[PDB]
């Protein structure tokens, strides 16, 4: 359960709060790592980070290239389907989408060759 101020609360099935934090940046989109040990967050500006499931510290940042970087573009889609977690060559099931409509399909946290395919239309979900 994540808020706009960056506050994150990871609760269990019953309600046992595993850990809560107040991250400094403004969160807008949140995903779950495919393996289940990483949590991907998205800033209001448009940047995406990878944190730990248990400790929650700032593990790394995803290498983005569809984002121009000139202005902070909000993001509209951030989903990582775990169907191929135990796949010898994991498919590009990660998806990062911005409000402009730039879709970037990565295969790992820090994939260097995403299958970024652009569309003219915008995107919301």
């Amino acid at each position: 359960i994540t808020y706009e101020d960056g506050a994150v609360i990871v609760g269990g099935v019953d309600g046992n709060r595993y850990w809560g934090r107040e991250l400094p940046y403004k969160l807008a989109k949140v995903c779950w790592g495919a393996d289940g040990n990483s949590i991907l967050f998205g800033t209001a500006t448009g940047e995406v980070y990878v944190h730990d499931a248990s400790s929650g510290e700032h593990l790394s940042q995803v290498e983005i290239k569809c984002n121009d970087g000139k202005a902070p573009s909000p993001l509209a889609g951030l989903s990582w389907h775990p169907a191929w977690v135990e796949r010898p060559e994991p498919l590009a099931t990660l998806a990062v989408c911005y409000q402009s409509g730039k879709l970037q399909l990565m295969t790992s946290i820090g994939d260097e060759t995403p299958c970024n395919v652009d569309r003219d239309l915008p995107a919301h979900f």
């Binding site: 248990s54 400790s55 510290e57 700032h58 593990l59 790394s60």
Partner: protein, 259 residues
């Protein structure tokens, strides 16, 4: 596992003595190679090793060279009582002196700023804050190693004092080694969330110490005195080099596999 030389350079002999290649660095991108010959920093490519840059800014011989995890700026430390911060193209960022000598340069893979290890103490130079606090140490340090997540910094010392002097936690876990600590590194592959530090103690011994100061596994004997610790295939193996005049690859347990 077959090993074959692809390219090899050699520093020119001056007055009959070739200055040592004390340090070596690879870019996180995997292309830039940084070496230090004499008073001069040299830049090569990974594939061919062509001499790209020949920076001459240090007045004396260079001991420590480090590369940032971003792949933009690398800092080289010469024996001229002064640390110089350099850019990829060759522009010095800042040239700040130390008291008597500088020994090591460590870059945190997460945060941008680095930590220098010198005679008086280890200085913390940051791009936002030029002010660096100064404190006393028993003597001059040897090496340094940051955690891959930036948790703790380990200082390798000749008398063996390895201290967990981290800015986040003021608590210190003291390691005692009878031998000099010339090369210590933090594993990038953590199993069960354990922080392990490999120390190449110069009594021909390789030791593993966790963040609790406990000897992980056993102490492994070596046929040399290791002076350069590294990991192979992201924690799969460990690379060692020393007085054997040979490069050896060991398991994470510590057993010898292949020179």
């Amino acid at each position: 596992m077959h090993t074959s030389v692809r390219w090899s350079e050699t520093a020119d002999a001056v007055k009959g003595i070739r200055p040592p290649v004390n340090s070596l660095c690879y870019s996180p991108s995997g292309d830039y190679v940084v070496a230090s010959c004499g008073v001069r920093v040299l830049v090569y490519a990974a594939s061919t090793g062509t001499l790209l840059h020949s920076l001459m800014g240090h007045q004396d011989t260079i001991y420590c060279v480090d590369y940032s995890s971003d792949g933009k700026n690398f800092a080289s430390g010469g024996a001229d009582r002064t640390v110089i911060v350099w850019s990829s193209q060759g522009e010095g960022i800042v040239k700040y002196q130390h008291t008597e000598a500088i020994q090591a340069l460590a870059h945190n893979p997460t945060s941008s700023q680095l930590a220098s290890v010198s005679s008086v103490d280890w200085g913390i130079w940051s791009p936002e804050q030029p002010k660096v606090s100064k404190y006393s140490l028993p003597s001059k340090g040897l090496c340094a190693a940051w955690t891959p997540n930036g948790k703790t910094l380990a200082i390798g010392m000749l008398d063996g004092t390895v201290m967990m002097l981290s800015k986040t936690s003021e608590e210190k876990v003291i390691i005692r080694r009878p031998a000099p600590v010339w090369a210590l590194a933090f594993t990038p592959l953590r199993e069960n969330g354990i922080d392990v530090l490999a120390i190449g103690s110069w009594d021909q011994r390789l030791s593993f110490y966790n963040l609790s100061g406990t000897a992980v596994g056993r102490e492994r004997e070596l046929d040399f005195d290791p002076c350069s610790v590294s990991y192979f295939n992201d924690g799969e193996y460990i690379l060692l080099s020393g007085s054997d005049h040979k490069v050896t690859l060991f398991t994470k347990d510590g057993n010898r596999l292949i020179e």
